[PDB]
Swiss-Prot record:
N-Glycosylated. Addition of a bisecting N-acetylglucosamine by MGAT3 blocks lysosomal targeting, further degradation and is required for maintaining stability under stress conditions. Its main location: membrane. Responsible for the proteolytic processing of the amyloid precursor protein (APP). Cleaves at the N-terminus of the A-beta peptide sequence, between residues 671 and 672 of APP, leads to the generation and extracellular release of beta-cleaved soluble APP, and a corresponding cell-associated C-terminal fragment which is later released by gamma-secretase. Cleaves CHL1. The gene is BACE1. One of its GO terms (cellular component) is lysosome. Induction: Up-regulated by the Ca(2+)-regulated transcription factor NFATC4. Residues 1-389 are extracellular. One of its GO terms (biological process) is cellular response to amyloid-beta. Expressed at high levels in the brain and pancreas. In the brain, expression is highest in the substantia nigra, locus coruleus and medulla oblongata. Keywords: Acetylation, Aspartyl protease, Cell membrane, Cell projection, Cytoplasmic vesicle, Disulfide bond, Endoplasmic reticulum, Endosome, Glycoprotein, Golgi apparatus, Hydrolase, Isopeptide bond, Lipoprotein, Lysosome, Membrane, Palmitate, Phosphoprotein, Protease, Signal, Transmembrane, Transmembrane helix, Ubl conjugation, Zymogen. Residues 18-359 form the Peptidase A1 domain. The chain holds residues 58 to 446 of 501 of the full protein. This is Beta-secretase 1. The keyword Disulfide bond applies.
Amino acid sequence: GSFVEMVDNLRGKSGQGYYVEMTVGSPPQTLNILVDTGSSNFAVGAAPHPFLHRYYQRQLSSTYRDLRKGVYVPYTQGKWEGELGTDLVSIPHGPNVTVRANIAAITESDKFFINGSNWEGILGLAYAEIARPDDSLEPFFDSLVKQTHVPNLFSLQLCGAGFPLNQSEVLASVGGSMIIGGIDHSLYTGSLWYTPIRREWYYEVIIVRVEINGQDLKMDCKEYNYDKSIVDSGTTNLRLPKKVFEAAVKSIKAASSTEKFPDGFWLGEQLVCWQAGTTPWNIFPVISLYLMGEVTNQSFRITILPQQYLRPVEDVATSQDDCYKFAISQSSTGTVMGAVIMEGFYVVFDRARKRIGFAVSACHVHDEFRTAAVEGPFVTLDMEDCGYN
């Protein structure tokens, strides 16, 4: 209920990712690792790269083991290739243990590493089912739980600032907490509500209803999970299947019509700027996603504010304007509850009980009039039918 050693162990921001410090090899080589619940490989830069201030030097680790096997991971517009091996790994501000884990040493990449993000590897926290090359490559958390007694679950509190952060500020500020093996009550308020993990590959869940300022989007719920719905800390936006996206955007535009924004804004391509401190949060609606509950015919909802779905971006121009990008975009691979959403809540990945908990985050951004919320219960029927096959 209180793992203060791990509290505030993350840094980063929604657009670049949130990362934790880790050490690999002997002697320890410290690297910043992106916390990604949308993937399952532990991989680190292992060769010079313009965006890497440091990287994994296998030849300098006495405990490095070569698995003599390559691995490839494709991305919409990016990817990385590496060589598999194992080594000793520790998390300085995590449990006091050392485990031997699979490590994909990244030798080639394109549009994977980000300029100034400050992370040098990625920690895939999802299940073996989606690990590359195949499910025989045990994921890090699975090795951690197998080799130690750390409880089988972790929790994440990703803290967005609500304003732009320069390189210096990101480096010198706390981006949140990753509590490994437990739940820390100081990270949230109110109650934790759990939704079932439908299947253990991605952290898949089922959304049963969506509202824009209380108004039911009213679509066949299967559409909300068309393909799948996952919780992904490695994705910046709240991503929605095409039909849902178009309906949601139509409703948000209608709720905000007192002000008009170019199409590029809604396409998440261009920013909208308001003079210092005048962002009209009140004209933008809240969005509630109802999730299947653990109790039969019961559901609960999580509600986010425009302070979560409008991502702050600096206006380099010598202006003091407050600028943002619309952080809801379309997906052809189902719903993704990305960093946008996670910044609003403390999220418990209870692998042990195959469930994900949501509570209002003690660090979510809001104003004096509205706050994110997690509320329940609601009597809802035939939710299983919202699931796609």
